[PDB]
Enzyme design. Sequence first.
Site, PDB file in Angstrom:
ATOM      1  N   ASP A  35     -17.595 -32.272   5.569  1.00 32.44           N
ATOM      2  CA  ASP A  35     -17.463 -33.298   4.541  1.00 32.44           C
ATOM      3  C   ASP A  35     -17.511 -32.651   3.155  1.00 32.44           C
ATOM      4  O   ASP A  35     -16.593 -31.920   2.774  1.00 32.44           O
ATOM      5  CB  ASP A  35     -18.573 -34.347   4.678  1.00 32.44           C
ATOM      6  CG  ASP A  35     -18.273 -35.625   3.900  1.00 32.44           C
ATOM      7  OD1 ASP A  35     -18.230 -35.576   2.651  1.00 32.44           O
ATOM      8  OD2 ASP A  35     -18.074 -36.681   4.540  1.00 32.44           O
ATOM      9  N   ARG A  37     -18.645 -30.221   2.224  1.00 33.11           N
ATOM     10  CA  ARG A  37     -18.889 -28.803   2.493  1.00 33.11           C
ATOM     11  C   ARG A  37     -20.170 -28.643   3.315  1.00 33.11           C
ATOM     12  O   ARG A  37     -21.182 -28.147   2.823  1.00 33.11           O
ATOM     13  CB  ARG A  37     -18.983 -28.003   1.181  1.00 33.11           C
ATOM     14  CG  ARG A  37     -18.852 -26.487   1.332  1.00 33.11           C
ATOM     15  CD  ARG A  37     -20.179 -25.815   1.657  1.00 33.11           C
ATOM     16  NE  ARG A  37     -20.156 -25.111   2.937  1.00 33.11           N
ATOM     17  CZ  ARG A  37     -21.167 -24.385   3.409  1.00 33.11           C
ATOM     18  NH1 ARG A  37     -22.286 -24.263   2.706  1.00 33.11           N
ATOM     19  NH2 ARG A  37     -21.059 -23.781   4.585  1.00 33.11           N
ATOM     20  N   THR A  78     -18.566 -26.341  -3.380  1.00 32.74           N
ATOM     21  CA  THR A  78     -18.949 -25.250  -2.498  1.00 32.74           C
ATOM     22  C   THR A  78     -20.054 -24.438  -3.154  1.00 32.74           C
ATOM     23  O   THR A  78     -20.963 -23.949  -2.478  1.00 32.74           O
ATOM     24  CB  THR A  78     -17.750 -24.337  -2.197  1.00 32.74           C
ATOM     25  OG1 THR A  78     -16.851 -25.019  -1.318  1.00 32.74           O
ATOM     26  CG2 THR A  78     -18.200 -23.048  -1.557  1.00 32.74           C
ATOM     27  N   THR A 100     -15.761 -29.344 -15.477  1.00 31.53           N
ATOM     28  CA  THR A 100     -16.897 -29.913 -16.204  1.00 31.53           C
ATOM     29  C   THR A 100     -17.927 -28.815 -16.470  1.00 31.53           C
ATOM     30  O   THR A 100     -18.462 -28.700 -17.575  1.00 31.53           O
ATOM     31  CB  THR A 100     -17.591 -31.052 -15.411  1.00 31.53           C
ATOM     32  OG1 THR A 100     -18.125 -30.535 -14.186  1.00 31.53           O
ATOM     33  CG2 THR A 100     -16.607 -32.168 -15.106  1.00 31.53           C
ATOM     34  N   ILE A 152     -12.834 -18.886  -0.593  1.00 38.83           N
ATOM     35  CA  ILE A 152     -13.837 -19.217   0.411  1.00 38.83           C
ATOM     36  C   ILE A 152     -14.194 -20.660   0.671  1.00 38.83           C
ATOM     37  O   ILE A 152     -15.177 -20.930   1.357  1.00 38.83           O
ATOM     38  CB  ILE A 152     -15.168 -18.512   0.125  1.00 38.83           C
ATOM     39  CG1 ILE A 152     -15.808 -19.120  -1.131  1.00 38.83           C
ATOM     40  CG2 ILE A 152     -14.940 -17.017  -0.020  1.00 38.83           C
ATOM     41  CD1 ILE A 152     -17.299 -18.828  -1.269  1.00 38.83           C
ATOM     42  N   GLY A 153     -13.456 -21.610   0.134  1.00 38.60           N
ATOM     43  CA  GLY A 153     -13.873 -22.952   0.460  1.00 38.60           C
ATOM     44  C   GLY A 153     -13.657 -24.083  -0.504  1.00 38.60           C
ATOM     45  O   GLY A 153     -13.552 -23.921  -1.725  1.00 38.60           O
ATOM     46  N   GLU A 160      -4.564 -26.023  -1.644  1.00 34.57           N
ATOM     47  CA  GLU A 160      -3.733 -25.441  -2.692  1.00 34.57           C
ATOM     48  C   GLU A 160      -3.350 -24.026  -2.308  1.00 34.57           C
ATOM     49  O   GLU A 160      -2.290 -23.531  -2.697  1.00 34.57           O
ATOM     50  CB  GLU A 160      -4.469 -25.423  -4.035  1.00 34.57           C
ATOM     51  CG  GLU A 160      -3.703 -24.716  -5.148  1.00 34.57           C
ATOM     52  CD  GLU A 160      -4.329 -24.934  -6.512  1.00 34.57           C
ATOM     53  OE1 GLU A 160      -5.496 -25.379  -6.552  1.00 34.57           O
ATOM     54  OE2 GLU A 160      -3.663 -24.654  -7.538  1.00 34.57           O
ATOM     55  N   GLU A 293       6.066  12.756  -7.997  1.00 36.78           N
ATOM     56  CA  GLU A 293       7.396  13.326  -7.783  1.00 36.78           C
ATOM     57  C   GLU A 293       8.507  12.523  -8.459  1.00 36.78           C
ATOM     58  O   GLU A 293       9.441  13.101  -9.006  1.00 36.78           O
ATOM     59  CB  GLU A 293       7.720  13.450  -6.289  1.00 36.78           C
ATOM     60  CG  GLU A 293       9.078  14.108  -6.047  1.00 36.78           C
ATOM     61  CD  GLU A 293       9.520  14.077  -4.596  1.00 36.78           C
ATOM     62  OE1 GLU A 293       9.597  12.969  -4.020  1.00 36.78           O
ATOM     63  OE2 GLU A 293       9.805  15.160  -4.034  1.00 36.78           O
ATOM     64  N   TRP A 315       6.550  20.446  -2.065  1.00 29.27           N
ATOM     65  CA  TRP A 315       7.586  21.446  -2.331  1.00 29.27           C
ATOM     66  C   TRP A 315       7.139  22.892  -2.114  1.00 29.27           C
ATOM     67  O   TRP A 315       7.916  23.822  -2.337  1.00 29.27           O
ATOM     68  CB  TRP A 315       8.119  21.307  -3.764  1.00 29.27           C
ATOM     69  CG  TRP A 315       9.017  20.126  -3.973  1.00 29.27           C
ATOM     70  CD1 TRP A 315       8.655  18.882  -4.402  1.00 29.27           C
ATOM     71  CD2 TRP A 315      10.429  20.075  -3.738  1.00 29.27           C
ATOM     72  NE1 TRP A 315       9.752  18.060  -4.451  1.00 29.27           N
ATOM     73  CE2 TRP A 315      10.855  18.764  -4.048  1.00 29.27           C
ATOM     74  CE3 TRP A 315      11.376  21.008  -3.294  1.00 29.27           C
ATOM     75  CZ2 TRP A 315      12.193  18.361  -3.929  1.00 29.27           C
ATOM     76  CZ3 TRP A 315      12.706  20.610  -3.177  1.00 29.27           C
ATOM     77  CH2 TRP A 315      13.101  19.294  -3.495  1.00 29.27           C
ATOM     78  N   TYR A 341      17.654  17.837  -7.567  1.00 27.66           N
ATOM     79  CA  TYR A 341      17.399  16.426  -7.862  1.00 27.66           C
ATOM     80  C   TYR A 341      17.452  15.967  -9.323  1.00 27.66           C
ATOM     81  O   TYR A 341      18.528  15.831  -9.911  1.00 27.66           O
ATOM     82  CB  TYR A 341      16.040  16.025  -7.273  1.00 27.66           C
ATOM     83  CG  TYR A 341      16.030  15.864  -5.771  1.00 27.66           C
ATOM     84  CD1 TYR A 341      16.741  14.832  -5.158  1.00 27.66           C
ATOM     85  CD2 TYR A 341      15.293  16.729  -4.961  1.00 27.66           C
ATOM     86  CE1 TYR A 341      16.718  14.661  -3.774  1.00 27.66           C
ATOM     87  CE2 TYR A 341      15.261  16.568  -3.570  1.00 27.66           C
ATOM     88  CZ  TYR A 341      15.976  15.531  -2.985  1.00 27.66           C
ATOM     89  OH  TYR A 341      15.953  15.351  -1.616  1.00 27.66           O
ATOM     90  N   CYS A 401      18.465  15.346  -0.205  1.00 30.19           N
ATOM     91  CA  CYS A 401      18.485  14.438   0.951  1.00 30.19           C
ATOM     92  C   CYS A 401      18.885  13.046   0.459  1.00 30.19           C
ATOM     93  O   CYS A 401      19.848  12.474   0.953  1.00 30.19           O
ATOM     94  CB  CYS A 401      17.109  14.382   1.632  1.00 30.19           C
ATOM     95  SG  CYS A 401      16.671  15.868   2.604  1.00 30.19           S
ATOM     96  N   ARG A 421      21.414  11.154   3.295  1.00 25.88           N
ATOM     97  CA  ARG A 421      22.149  11.824   4.365  1.00 25.88           C
ATOM     98  C   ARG A 421      21.305  12.187   5.588  1.00 25.88           C
ATOM     99  O   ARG A 421      21.771  12.124   6.724  1.00 25.88           O
ATOM    100  CB  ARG A 421      22.783  13.108   3.826  1.00 25.88           C
ATOM    101  CG  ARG A 421      21.754  14.181   3.455  1.00 25.88           C
ATOM    102  CD  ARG A 421      22.410  15.443   2.917  1.00 25.88           C
ATOM    103  NE  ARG A 421      21.416  16.415   2.468  1.00 25.88           N
ATOM    104  CZ  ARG A 421      20.709  17.211   3.269  1.00 25.88           C
ATOM    105  NH1 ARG A 421      20.876  17.176   4.583  1.00 25.88           N
ATOM    106  NH2 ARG A 421      19.813  18.035   2.750  1.00 25.88           N
ATOM    107  N   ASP A 424      14.047  11.583   7.767  1.00 21.39           N
ATOM    108  CA  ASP A 424      12.919  11.776   8.670  1.00 21.39           C
ATOM    109  C   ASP A 424      12.225  10.416   8.689  1.00 21.39           C
ATOM    110  O   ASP A 424      11.547  10.053   7.734  1.00 21.39           O
ATOM    111  CB  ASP A 424      11.974  12.843   8.106  1.00 21.39           C
ATOM    112  CG  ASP A 424      10.699  12.978   8.912  1.00 21.39           C
ATOM    113  OD1 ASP A 424       9.845  13.803   8.533  1.00 21.39           O
ATOM    114  OD2 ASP A 424      10.547  12.263   9.921  1.00 21.39           O
ATOM    115  N   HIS A 462      16.563  10.242  11.976  1.00 21.71           N
ATOM    116  CA  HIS A 462      15.947  10.846  13.141  1.00 21.71           C
ATOM    117  C   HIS A 462      14.426  10.791  13.183  1.00 21.71           C
ATOM    118  O   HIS A 462      13.761  10.538  12.182  1.00 21.71           O
ATOM    119  CB  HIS A 462      16.402  12.305  13.238  1.00 21.71           C
ATOM    120  CG  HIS A 462      16.189  13.082  11.973  1.00 21.71           C
ATOM    121  ND1 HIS A 462      17.065  13.031  10.908  1.00 21.71           N
ATOM    122  CD2 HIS A 462      15.170  13.882  11.582  1.00 21.71           C
ATOM    123  CE1 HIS A 462      16.593  13.765   9.916  1.00 21.71           C
ATOM    124  NE2 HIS A 462      15.444  14.292  10.300  1.00 21.71           N
TER     125      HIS A 462
END
Lengths: 519, 520
Positions: A35, A37, A78, A100, A152-153, A160, A293, A315, A341, A401, A421, A424, A462
């Site tokens: 009710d 809580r 609660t 309030t 929690i309650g 909501e 990186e 690396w 890169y 890669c 290409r 892993d 792979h």
Amino acid sequence: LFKIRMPETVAEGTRLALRAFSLVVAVDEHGGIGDGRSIPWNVPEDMKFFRDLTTKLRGKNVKPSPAKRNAVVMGRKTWDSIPPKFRPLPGRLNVVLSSTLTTQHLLDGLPDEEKRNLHADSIVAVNGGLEQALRLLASPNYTPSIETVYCIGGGSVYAEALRPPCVHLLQAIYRTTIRASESSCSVFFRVPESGTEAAAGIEWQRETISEELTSANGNETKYYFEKLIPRNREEEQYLSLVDRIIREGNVKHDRTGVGTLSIFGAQMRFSLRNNRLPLLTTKRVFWRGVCEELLWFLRGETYAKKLSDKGVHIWDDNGSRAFLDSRGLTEYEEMDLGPVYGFQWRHFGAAYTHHDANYDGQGVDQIKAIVETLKTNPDDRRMLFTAWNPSALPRMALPPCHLLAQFYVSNGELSCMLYQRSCDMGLGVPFNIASYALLTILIAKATGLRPGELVHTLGDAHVYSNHVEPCNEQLKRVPRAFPYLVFRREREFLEDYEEGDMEVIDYAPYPPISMKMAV
Amino acid sequence: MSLFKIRMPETVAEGTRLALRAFSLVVAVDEHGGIGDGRSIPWNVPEDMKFFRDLTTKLRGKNVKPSPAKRNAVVMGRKTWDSIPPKFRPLPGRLNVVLSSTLTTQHLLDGLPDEEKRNLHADSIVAVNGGLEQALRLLASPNYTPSIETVYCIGGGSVYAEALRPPCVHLLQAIYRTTIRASESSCSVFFRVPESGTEAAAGIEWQRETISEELTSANGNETKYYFEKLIPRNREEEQYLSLVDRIIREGNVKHDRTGVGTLSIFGAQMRFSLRNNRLPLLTTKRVFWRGVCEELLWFLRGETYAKKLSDKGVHIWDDNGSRAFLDSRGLTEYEEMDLGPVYGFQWRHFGAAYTHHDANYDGQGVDQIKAIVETLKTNPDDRRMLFTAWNPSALPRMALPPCHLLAQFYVSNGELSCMLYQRSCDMGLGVPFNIASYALLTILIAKATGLRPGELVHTLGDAHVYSNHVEPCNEQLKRVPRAFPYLVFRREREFLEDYEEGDMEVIDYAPYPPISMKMA
Ligand SMILES: CC1(C)N=C(N)N=C(N)N1c1ccc(Cl)cc1
Ligand SMILES: CC1(C)N=C(N)N=C(N)N1c1ccc(Cl)cc1
């Protein structure tokens, strides 16, 4: 002059609107919570579960401090249900929803003043609903200091939490079912069913459910636990592919004896909207390395020592005196990888000598070009950059890669497609999904756009042979919800960003794969 | 150029020779599936006889009467040939192929009424000592392919059965079945199309392309009958149609600076098999194969002068090679139709400095195609076998950046697969063209490396349908894709760069007709 200047909208495109959270509730065999809580069916095992769950931090070493602790959001009723003498719940920030009461108001309700100040930090009132609370917890003061938020309650607080927009931030639902027969539960708890409108596209699924347990509280109360999570179809793309490769892939062996199972040609999609970060949850991704990186790539760096000195050793092997000489790159100092890169990204085609040279304004700065195009003509169909330079490959320690990326814009959102290409699936792919997600987010922040989607196209995909068993173990895990990415601060130039400027929050990956190393 | 050129291996033809010719099947059954009480056929429905006659005799593109240089073929069992009155033997306007383990071609001739008839039909009759499979094998020979336009299996419970099971059923392009309401005509042999999902169907999903309304025969008993045309579902072409549909229903509308509108989605991928001579030329809309082939060959030779294409009637580069367009790109020093270092130039001379198209570039730049060909023959599992034309350094010097800019190869079980990356894809006319181009390239590379053609994977970046193509594309979406055609080589070459469009031919290509109405 050579750097990329960030617009004034740099922070607005990625500002966290609402913090992610979990929900913890106790119900009876009929879905009733109580009710105003109630708790008279108090099962000591549940209270302890609740206490441990909401109090403990992931870092199996860290103790709750105002700098790092969990939060518990609750309705006023609660909070009132908590014996004044036992308020607030210790080791957690108590966020009370009330229209309030005020922070001082809640504070004075506590007996002795010795704690009316020792807990002045552990209590905060929010004049609004759950959404406002999550909006507040999304501010710099609470994110990322708050590791996990738990609703929690309060029947109205749960309701909501289970409807949009808050449901889209619900990472998990912990439900305890007390098989005690009472009708004093005017309100019921209902998890939206799969495929119904109320579910708003989310497919709730049990990650776990315990067997029926019996309390040691004298009543022999029967109760059990459940952990429900929002199905992560995106991460399932990756798992399905791994399984397919192990089940149907072609086995091949290196000229050095290394074996792999593989398939050719695949594509996966990942959303980057609303701060979502596709860091796989079934196996922890080394995010700090990913971030270092990537920033390294954006700055057009070629000296691997800069990464090595940051604890990122990805690396090392390809940056040694031996490897380099094996490639005929004798004049390269150790860790100098050559025009790899990021160098091609910012200086495509520039002649390389040593990582020490000043390459400002050299070659084609593809990233700068894409940035300017995105801001003036976002519908351009030539917004892509590549590291695949046949003329420079021989001068590189290694051929790239992930070698090509194309951008696309729709409705103010920036999407990106990466082509790899060789992939892993075990270690590399999760890493690279993270890198390009980060890259897309940064480029969006540099162009006044919102991060959209990351499309990942794979060539040779792979799984290494001696990865099959551990991969099969991971294939048993049901992916959890993804974490989010937020920025602590911004920068004037893209190249100025550091790994410490952003933080990954609500990342709850599964534990390491027990690859029985011995014993 | 010899060493500058790519020499073809001795197996050049080996892994491309057509093993069996595709074919269609035409049959008449009663309401129970029976084809004949045993060997006879107690039902002579006039309208069915005419259909059969028209279907097996006619060629595509009307106004073309059958001849020894272009005609269809009918394949039948010996007992079926015997059921034909010696006077109507052989069926006119068609090569009659008869399956028999006891009768030679000469024996079949001896059976004709007189000598005059035998000399007049000697070229329209051929016996094959074996079953349907041996016939399809013979029909795949240079003497019959592409000479024979369509092969029709016409009868014999024994021939139908073989046609409906592997390996022949994989070459069956369509089934034309006529169903007649026979009265009390209980036969013995039953014609049944394998159901979808059953072991018997062998992965094929038979579906009706068409079915007529119930008709009434003008004969004596007013027999009720109807027709059906069944075809093997083409999931591969459906990939393309499904994508087109999704773009129109959900794509993002955009208009460029010219006011050109498009609907688009971002990021897609499709797969097409190239095994056993299959060529993925879309059937719901005829593709300009001669243009695809001439341009691809043009790319491979590393050409940059579009005039070579226009002089052959391929005008796909006219707009992007005009003085006006070249000037709009600041390429005022280029001869008209000289596109600069585009596509093939980067494929065979990546990074080489460009002046004009007629300059000698032999040995200049990185010849990516030659490198891949060598790697495929010695280290097929290498994961770096890819070529690109996306060279940021040369882009400004090009008439326009490449659309299909990267391709990677993969090998498994002696089969060569290729992945293509296309940044911009016009689904209407461009994509079908591109699919065919890279299917061709993969087949040629396979031939140059002692491998067998495998799969073509097509990755799409910005995939769009022009606004002016929406209505027609919608019409096309109605059409149920038909089985794909095949590619055969009538001759081989010493070097890759020596291949000509006339060295190969697309056979059994049955695309739907042009889409009604114009303007767009
Ligand atoms: C302990 C209990 C009943 N149990 C669960 N599973 N969840 C909650 N949220 N609880 C709860 C905790 C604190 C408060 Cl104040 C109210 C209810
Ligand atoms: C005309 C008929 C009965 N009708 C169909 N649909 N199919 C055949 N194969 N036929 C046929 C044609 C010639 C011969 Cl000799 C035998 C049967």
